């Protein structure tokens, strides 16, 4: 008998939106209203990448842009290696019929021995996005790299620094000064590949996939513009994986369709009992009151 539930703050009492809109900020309330309006109307452009430190909001790169970057990466031949292969082994394929393309797969060694594919870390040069995709769905980790002039270095941070399954991991280009691949030796846990510990060893500060949405709620006393910025709590759908799977993309399509069924009246809309926080934003000596949605998630909808 309510479409979204609070995950905390259930001792509070419901505040009407007319009372909130004239109140001082910051303050935290408990509301329940109906979703009259929301942006974007096109949900595929709701997934962005928040940098947890510098609070950078940016777009998840396009897949076609990813496909071009790796297609362009196929060039000449690598830097081989050197007495450097103490951390990893290697195997260079020569391709026929592709302008002399020669990929370089490098297998990270666990304490000196090589592991199984389910706990291995791959290092590719000149791979194509599709070949990157299928490598990721059988191996544990795939880090696309290039041959620097001394040691293997990462790509431009437009391309992910880590790929495990359907999750591409991006580092913030503005607050992450890189360390090169041979700093992965510093890991004490070289069987479990924690993206946070790979990013830390590389000096990469990772971005966060978060759904960014704007809601126009209405409880009958006034409408409110509540922002929704969350990673994997609200929809119970991880924003890290959503752009790589029909089933999760489809599932958030129908959840918004039950919040706001387009085609019928708002009389038959379900209530959204949310917990919001108000705060003061400044754009000069401008001063707005705006509201973020917290501690809320859908219930019984999978």
């Amino acid at each position: 008998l309510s479409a979204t539930i609070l995950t905390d703050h259930q001792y509070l009492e419901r505040t009407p939106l007319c009372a909130i809109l004239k109140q001082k900020a910051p303050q935290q309330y408990r509301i329940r209203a109906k979703l009259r309006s929301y942006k974007p109307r096109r949900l595929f452009q709701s997934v962005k990448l928040h940098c947890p430190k510098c609070h950078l909001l940016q777009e998840v790169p396009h897949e076609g842009d990813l496909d071009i970057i790796f297609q362009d990466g196929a060039t000449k031949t690598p830097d081989v290696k050197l007495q450097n292969t103490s951390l990893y082994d290697s195997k260079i394929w020569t391709t026929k019929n592709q302008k002399g393309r020669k990929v370089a797969v490098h297998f990270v060694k666990n304490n000196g021995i090589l592991p199984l594919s389910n706990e291995c870390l791959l290092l590719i040069e000149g791979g194509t996005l599709s070949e990157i995709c299928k490598l990721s769905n059988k191996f544990n980790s795939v880090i696309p790299v290039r041959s620097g002039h001394e040691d293997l270095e990462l790509l431009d941070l437009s391309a992910p620094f880590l790929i495990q399954g359907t999750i591409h991991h991006y580092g913030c280009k503005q607050c992450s000064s890189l360390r090169s691949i041979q700093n992965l030796n510093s890991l004490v846990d070289k069987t479990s590949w924690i993206p946070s510990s790979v990013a830390e060893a590389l000096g990469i500060v990772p971005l966060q996939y978060v759904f960014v949405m704007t809601f126009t709620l209405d409880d009958g006393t006034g409408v409110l513009e509540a922002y929704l910025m969350d990673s994997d709590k609200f929809f119970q759908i991880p924003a890290s994986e959503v752009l790589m799977d029909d089933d999760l993309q489809k599932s958030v399509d129908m959840i918004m369709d039950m919040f706001c069924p387009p085609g019928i009246k708002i009389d038959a809309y379900p209530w959204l009992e949310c917990f919001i926080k108000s705060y003061n934003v400044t754009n000069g000596t401008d001063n707005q009151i705006c509201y973020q949605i917290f501690d809320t998630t859908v219930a019984e909808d999978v």
Binding site: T94, V105, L116, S117, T214, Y279, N283
Partner: protein
């Protein structure tokens, strides 16, 4: 016995041989390499050429430090 065949063999190479192997299973080194799959969200992100796409200024989401200090009260 192939179960036991693997035991009496150099672990280095069964690990070595099974790694470069699923890896060459994934590469398309024979001619034109294939085209990656697209899900219906990715295919329509490449045709949102009109307006400004939905994105909020990070000013409106980054809660101030001094208003967040207030927010952990009561």
């Amino acid at each position: 016995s192939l179960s036991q065949l693997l035991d009496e063999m150099r672990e280095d190479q069964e690990h070595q041989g099974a790694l470069v192997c699923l890896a060459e299973s994934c590469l398309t080194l024979e001619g034109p390499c294939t085209a990656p799959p697209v899900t219906h969200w990715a295919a329509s992100r490449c045709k949102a050429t009109g307006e400004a796409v939905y994105t909020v200024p990070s000013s409106m989401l980054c809660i101030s430090e001094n208003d967040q200090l207030i927010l952990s009260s009561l």
